[PDB]
RNA sequence: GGAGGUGGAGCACGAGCGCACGUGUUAGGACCCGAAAGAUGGUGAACUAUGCCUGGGCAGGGCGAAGCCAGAGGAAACUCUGGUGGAGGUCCGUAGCGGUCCUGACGUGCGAAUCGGUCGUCCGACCUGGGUAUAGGGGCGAAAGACUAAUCGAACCAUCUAGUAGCUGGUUCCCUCCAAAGUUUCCCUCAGGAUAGCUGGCGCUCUCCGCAGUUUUAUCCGGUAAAGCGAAUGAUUAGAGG
RNA sequence: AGCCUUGAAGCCUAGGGCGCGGGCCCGGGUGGAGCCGCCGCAGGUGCAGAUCUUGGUGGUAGUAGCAAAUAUUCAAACGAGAACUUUGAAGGCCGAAGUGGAGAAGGGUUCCAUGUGAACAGCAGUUGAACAUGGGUCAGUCGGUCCUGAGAGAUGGGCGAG
RNA sequence: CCCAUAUCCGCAGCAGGUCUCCAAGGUGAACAGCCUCUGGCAUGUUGGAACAAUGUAGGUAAGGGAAGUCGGCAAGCCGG
RNA sequence: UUAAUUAAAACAAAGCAUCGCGAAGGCCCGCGGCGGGUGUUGACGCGAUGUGAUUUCUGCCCAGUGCUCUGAAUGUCAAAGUGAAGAAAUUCAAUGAAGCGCGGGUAAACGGCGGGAGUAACUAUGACUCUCUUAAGGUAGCCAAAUGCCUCGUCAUCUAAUUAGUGACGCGCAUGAAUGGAUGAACGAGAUUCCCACUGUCCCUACCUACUAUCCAGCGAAACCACAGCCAAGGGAACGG
RNA sequence: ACAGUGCCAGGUGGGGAGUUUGACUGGGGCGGUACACCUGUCAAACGGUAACGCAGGUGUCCUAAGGCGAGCUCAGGGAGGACAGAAACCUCCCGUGGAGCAGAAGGGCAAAAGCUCGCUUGAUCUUGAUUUUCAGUACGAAUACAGACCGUGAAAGCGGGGCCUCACGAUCCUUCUGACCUUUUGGGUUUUAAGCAGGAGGUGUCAGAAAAGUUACCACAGGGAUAACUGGCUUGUGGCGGCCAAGCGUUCAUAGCGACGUCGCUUUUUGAUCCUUCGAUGUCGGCUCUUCCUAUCAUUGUGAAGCAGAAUUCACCAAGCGUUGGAUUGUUCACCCACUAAUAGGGAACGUGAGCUGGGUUUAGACCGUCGUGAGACAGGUUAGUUUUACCCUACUGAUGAUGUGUUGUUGCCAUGGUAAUCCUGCUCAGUACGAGAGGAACCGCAGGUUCAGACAUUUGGUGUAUGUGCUUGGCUGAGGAGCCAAUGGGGCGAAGCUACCAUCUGUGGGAUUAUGACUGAACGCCUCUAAGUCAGAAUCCCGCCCAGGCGGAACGAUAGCGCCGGAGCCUCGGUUGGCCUCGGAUAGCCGGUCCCCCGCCGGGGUCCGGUGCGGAGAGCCCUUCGUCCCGGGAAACGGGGCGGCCGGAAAGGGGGCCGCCCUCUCGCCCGUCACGCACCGCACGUUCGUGGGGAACCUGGCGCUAAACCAUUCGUAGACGACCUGCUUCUGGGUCGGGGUUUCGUACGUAGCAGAGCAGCUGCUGCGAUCUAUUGAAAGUCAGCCCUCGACACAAGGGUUUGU
């Protein structure tokens, strides 16, 4: 019979299966559509989540109760050191779909690029690209590559730029580069590869790919949270405390017709560590990392046109189990998937941004930099001397 | 003794007895296993029920009965006030005894009734050891058909006894041939029998005229289909002429 | 005038066959002492079942489980072997209505010494209330013994087939 | 000799049952509970490593305060 | 108090009221007797019942069924005895114990305790009247009560809203007087309603601890099993592995 | 002389014993009797034929209503006759039975079978046969006779009951009647008793026991032959929907409704039935959770109104998304309160008890009412009443993994499967359109929110055994200090982590189209959204975005006794027995040339000419194999065979053609001349693709390569275990300790104090004293999963198992 009182079911079955994700870094299932008018740039970036905290903006927003108002927003610091291009790899249209045609690699390739090749980098001879190599430097080399580059002008439709990050400069353990294929959009695809080839071993900063006030896309796997029930894997309704057997359950996982449990039925196992792509996340600023200028080591990439002080992004005793933030980093309004030290995947939109609030303009009045490891309550050390005094240590 | 009818499991020139084999029906344990029951004679009150005998046991508190002392009041009766006193199938509560709820734990348990918290009572119609008495259509019951050795709206043990069962289940090698019925009547008959029918087997009396789930030719029988209702019975519409 | 220690019955066999079949024959192996053909006689004479009887074995399955009562750690000794035995030292618990010291009923040698580590003690054990070989309970005065208690129970007598 | 979370009865070294005697300090009304001395024990028929779900047993919870449920069941408030 | 699903409103109880009995007796046991229990007793006792403290009250009915009392006045009435017929067996008659019939008493014995119509100067009711009628025709009380079908009765109160609760009403399907009626302090692990307080019961869930589960070494069962084990429809012993 | 006892006799005697307490039956019970009979019908023209089928009857009645004879004629009607009339009695006429014959009905009957008289007892005695039911038994009833006695009639005759079809009863026992009856046991007489034959006493459950209840304290053997669920057939009832059109709607049938009638659909109502299940399918409701239907309440896109606006009603495509919080009740159902866009209706074994709960129903205790003598009963109330098992298979959720790609790794594609966003409010439009007024919109824009989904912890909150730091109770270590125990002693605050619409962030684009409105346009000289053709078109659908990623591919790196190129064989697996190397397409039209003309980066259009049952044909084309020899003739000579280079190929990429070479042949093809070869004596598996695929090896030359993976360790971005993410010598690495930063609590011990309410002792001093001030934002902790050090210390160049085209 028809159940009682309707309600909506528990949960989005288009988020199925709640598995465990096979990848660790946030693939780009769908890069945006190639406009063959504009100029030749990339499309996606690699940074890791630093951390989060908190600023004071005016908003501009007419006809909003909260016009020529000061607001205070949550932000995430995702840590962007420059990537380096290594390689380029050439895609054909064919009427099974997409199939990779032709993959080239730079004479040289760094060390924490050829870590994502071996599984125990202690155990290797680190004997990666080394015949590959010796096709730069001879003349019968040389013309095979050309000829590889000639053939991927007359065949290929889609071009990338295998590019890794720079695990050296970052505060982590790992030394592992995450290495991943960006999408080349703009012009023809002969000014996809000379634009391509021209950068391998090069440096890419992330202002290169975004900008300012830019809507993003956010690509990562979720943390992991283990072994879930259905009360807090779906969200299902706890059961009366009188119930014998438990009550963190679904009470009927099925009708008795059809003799199956159904697909659609909340179950027990893994929550968390699940693939998720989220859009519409706003650049709030692209900070710049610190510059050593006639001996000064300038860092003060957290003040704002309002707030002169001379402080870094990183709050007091440092971004919480994550460490310091050294090189550029994307602000992001809001929140993202993943851990700290998570690497996620920035992606350029796949959509239209016309709509006052994808087109605001960000204006910082103040960047929050208190302690996150208590309830810190001095932006700076210098205020918090200065508020002190001295001390016995002193 | 005769004549003529009628009842008999008769005579009318024997066919029986003895033995053996098969089949069928029965009486017996009765093809095998299966009741709830009933009867006789015995063993249990080490659990529990109840009476009796002789022993043991039950913190700390609350309330504050009668009696008594003093002071005040009063003409008397007596009254008031403050103490003392320590009653009670009296109250909170431990040991003890019990077992309300969680409808908790457990539910192939630690346990064939237990465990946790929470709970009832806790000087009495109180709790308990041992001795002793009441024994099965009997006891004992502050009464629930409760208890009477994990057994109780009649214990347990052995025998009668292989109790009876129109009811459930089973019923063991091969080939060959033939091959049903669920219908009639009677039955406290309706899940069953007896009875006729349907089957099989053994033959025997003949044969190389008789018979037939058929037609033909003759000849009867019938009251359904249809038809009729300006024909009987019954029902029924409309005008018309007297 | 059957077969058989020059190998019976039984049992096994990707061996050769026979018969519509019930079954049977022969070859090979194992076995070690009896057995079969034909004419008759006799029957406690043929199993897939009966929640059949008795015995054995599976999958489940190296699975459920070995979670009631706060708790162990260090060093050494013996030893083949040590989370579990002994000693020493720590840290804990029962907390005088005890996890202390003694009895009644019941048990019946479980008591004590030495030895073993087969089986048992739902891991292990160098340990045990297990197994083995030997010991141990001393009374005029502590109980029984005697008294009678509720009660049980002869004789006389009565009843009674007994 | 045991006299009972192992010498007895429950098939067993069974969280059950089974009659008694003696009875320290502190707190406190107290043979209550909590800690300790005398005496006793080794956590109750195993250990190691983890710290998922679901349990069993304990706790805490902003704002509301029975709207939950058959029912305030459960817990909670009160407490000398 | 139902050991082991019911702890209760059930049982008991003091109180109350009946009933039998003066011992060669009442009540009871026993196969049996100069047998036995009450009874080491004696009506302020023993035996058999009902109700269930106190308070207040306990109405009418003896026709029914019981129980009980009186009996030669006296219908029926066994054996035995008496008389007559007959050869006797036998038959017939006369007589007439208890018990039944007959007549009283008795309900704190089992139990019971009506119907129709008309009627007051608006309407409604109808104190009043008529009538049929039984052994009485339900009195004092009480009630949609643990008792009322219709029914979630009607009015009021309690809520925003109440098949719940409480107070009223009462032609009450089918209330009612020791089959006890009405009450009422204290008491209740008894049933029910509301309120204050309290709170994770809930909105709406989260986190923390211990023991498991978990993995490992050792050790290690049981229930159950035709063969088994992916679905849709079909047909089918009318829902197929 | 009674109590008393022994033995008989009568009464009483559920205290106790035994036993019974029918059958049929759309379950049983209650109700009926279809249980023994009879008539009509069913019944299908012999007979027979069932149902709790239909319409009825029977357990009697008759001294005549049996028997005979005779004589008459009935119901009804018409017409006449004093009282007399509708109806009394008399008369005449008609009268086929329309009357009567005991009764139910059917049949039969007119000088009779009816009515009336006269005489009577054939309703008597007796043996057999027969018919009906049937078994060809009994009874019952009936039919023909036969033998006696009779009645009646003049007689023929008729009659042994009723005009025919019903009206009834075994054995045993009792009673009566009959005989010059038999027996009555050793004989005789006599009473008695028993026999034989015929009646009666009765069994209606009528082929014939002698028979009351209750069980909820219940029991056994069974039954799915049989009820209480689901399911199945059916659909009366329920629900929903059409058709006709009398009316309603002031007018006007059909905007919206719709009588009298009628046709359907559904199985979310109840029935009917009894097919499955009684060696058990857990029986109401709620809770929880998913899914599906549409008969659509809301929302999107629409059509019609008796649509001015607003509000509403009818209808279409339509199930994407929603459809709520509560008081009373166990409730389903209902009723009300409140909010809302709306508060639609249903299924999934009346979804869902090894998912719960257990309020109700539905055991055992108990109360009330009614009923019963009672035990007891009650779709009547009330209260208390045990909710068992998963470790198996599957499904599902997650987790390792498996084939096979030579091994291994990085980066990727996407086949398939999933899939998502949703509704409302405010402002403006606008007090505008519309409207007399009252009232009163909409599209575009802007700002928010609801429901849902996916995350996240900067902030606020929650937790907190960091057992971090204070406070604090009882006890314990002799005290201080420092601590511990009280199953987390209690409490304040609290890091990290986790976590809350209880904080914060984010949630998206196309295509074809449905309904509908249209274009052009015939059919059908007009018209027409339709017929051919064409356009706009949506919470629908499909896709995208997003989640997974195949016994599915790809590119690229590195490849340890192994890779690449260049002899005999041996195993094993099979199949096969010439090749076609390509326009695009139309089909009411095609193909090839022609370029002479027009365009273009040699190709397109035109013209012109040829073919078109395609012959520049798949009905086709190419290749064709017996070999060699001698010498001729045609054909080649621009020729055949054999090492270096350049254009060219990517959807799954060419051992094609062409330029050189140094060579090498004048033989290859056709027709002839000339002979030869194992000619194996008629015969199968012959004849290739075939140096086929795969596997071991054995060689024998050249050119080349010297890896990773897993374990172990470590990490914590991960986690039940596996798995996953990381580190493991660049004078560099991680680790440990130390230091610094951050942060929590809140000011340490000691020491000093002429601070301290007081008290004690000594003559102002010295003691005891909770607490207070300074030292002292002090002390203590702080990554175990916080940040930075490069100070100290050691360690680190390792170990095991595998893998080859
Ligand atoms: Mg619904
Ligand atoms: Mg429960
Ligand atoms: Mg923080
Ligand atoms: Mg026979
Ligand atoms: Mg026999
Ligand atoms: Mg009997
Ligand atoms: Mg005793
Ligand atoms: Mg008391
Ligand atoms: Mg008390
Ligand atoms: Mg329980
Ligand atoms: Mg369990
Ligand atoms: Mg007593
Ligand atoms: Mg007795
Ligand atoms: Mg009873
Ligand atoms: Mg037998
Ligand atoms: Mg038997
Ligand atoms: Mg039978
Ligand atoms: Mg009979
Ligand atoms: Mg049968
Ligand atoms: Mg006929
Ligand atoms: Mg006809
Ligand atoms: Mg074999
Ligand atoms: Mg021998
Ligand atoms: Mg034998
Ligand atoms: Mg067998
Ligand atoms: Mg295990
Ligand atoms: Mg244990
Ligand atoms: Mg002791
Ligand atoms: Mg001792
Ligand atoms: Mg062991
Ligand atoms: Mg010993
Ligand atoms: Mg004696
Ligand atoms: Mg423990
Ligand atoms: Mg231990
Ligand atoms: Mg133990
Ligand atoms: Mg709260
Ligand atoms: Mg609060
Ligand atoms: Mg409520
Ligand atoms: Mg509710
Ligand atoms: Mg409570
Ligand atoms: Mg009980
Ligand atoms: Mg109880
Ligand atoms: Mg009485
Ligand atoms: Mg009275
Ligand atoms: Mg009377
Ligand atoms: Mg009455
Ligand atoms: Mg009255
Ligand atoms: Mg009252
Ligand atoms: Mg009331
Ligand atoms: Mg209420
Ligand atoms: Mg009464
Ligand atoms: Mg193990
Ligand atoms: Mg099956
Ligand atoms: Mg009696
Ligand atoms: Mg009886
Ligand atoms: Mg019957
Ligand atoms: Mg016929
Ligand atoms: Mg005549
Ligand atoms: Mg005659
Ligand atoms: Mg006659
Ligand atoms: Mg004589
Ligand atoms: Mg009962
Ligand atoms: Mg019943
Ligand atoms: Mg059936
Ligand atoms: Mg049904
Ligand atoms: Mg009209
Ligand atoms: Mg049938
Ligand atoms: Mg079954
Ligand atoms: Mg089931
Ligand atoms: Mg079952
Ligand atoms: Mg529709
Ligand atoms: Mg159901
Ligand atoms: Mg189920
Ligand atoms: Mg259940
Ligand atoms: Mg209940
Ligand atoms: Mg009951
Ligand atoms: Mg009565
Ligand atoms: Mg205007
Ligand atoms: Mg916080
Ligand atoms: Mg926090
Ligand atoms: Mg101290
Ligand atoms: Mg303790
Ligand atoms: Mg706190
Ligand atoms: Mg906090
Ligand atoms: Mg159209
Ligand atoms: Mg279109
Ligand atoms: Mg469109
Ligand atoms: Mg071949």
């Not at 190599?133 to 000639?150: I, Y």
Request: charged share 30%.
């Amino acid at each position: 019979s028809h159940r009682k009182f309707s309600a909506p079911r528990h949960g989005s079955l288009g988020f199925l299966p709640r598995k465990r994700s096979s990848r660790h870094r946030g693939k780009v299932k769908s890069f945006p559509k190639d406009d063959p008018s504009k100029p030749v740039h990339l499309t996606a970036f690699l940074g890791y989540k630093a951390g989060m905290t908190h600023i004071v903006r005016e908003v501009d927003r007419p006809g909003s109760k909260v016009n020529k108002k000061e607001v205070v927003e949550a932000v995430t610091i995702v840590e962007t050191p420059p990537m380096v291009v290594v390689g380029i790899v050439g895609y054909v249209e064919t009427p099974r779909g997409l199939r990779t045609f032709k993959t080239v690699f730079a004479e040289h390739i760094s060390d924490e690029c050829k870590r994502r090749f071996y599984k125990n980098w202690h155990k290797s001879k680190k004997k990666a690209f080394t015949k590959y190599c010796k096709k730069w430097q001879d003349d019968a080399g040389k013309r095979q590559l050309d000829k590889d580059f000639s053939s991927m002008k007359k065949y290929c439709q889609v071009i990338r730029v295998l590019a890794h990050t720079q695990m050296r400069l970052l505060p982590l353990r790992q030394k592992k580069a995450h290495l991943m294929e960006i999408q080349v959009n703009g012009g023809t695809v002969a000014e996809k590869l000379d634009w391509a080839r021209e950068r391998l071993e090069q440096q890419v900063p992330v202002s290169q790919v975004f900008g300012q006030d830019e809507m993003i896309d956010v690509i990562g796997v979720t943390k992991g949270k283990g072994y879930k029930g259905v009360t807090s894997r779906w969200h299902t309704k706890k059961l009366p405390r009188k119930t014998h057997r438990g009550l963190r359950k679904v009470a009927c996982i099925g009708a008795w017709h059809p003799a199956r449990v159904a697909f659609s039925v909340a179950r027990a196992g893994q929550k968390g560590y699940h693939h998720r792509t989220e859009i519409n996340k706003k650049i709030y600023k692209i900070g710049q990392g610190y510059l050593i200028k006639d001996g000064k080591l300038i860092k003060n990439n957290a003040s704002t046109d309002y707030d002169l002080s001379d402080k870094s992004i990183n709050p007091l005793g440092g971004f919480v189990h994550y460490g310091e933030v050294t090189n550029d980093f994307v602000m992001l309004k809001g929140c993202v998937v993943g851990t700290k030290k998570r690497v996620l995947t920035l992606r350029k939109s796949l959509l239209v941004q016309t709509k006052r609030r994808a087109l605001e303009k960000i204006d910082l009045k103040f960047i929050d930099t208190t302690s996150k490891f208590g309830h810190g309550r001095f932006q700076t050390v210098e205020e918090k001397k200065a508020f002190m005094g001295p001390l016995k240590k002193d």
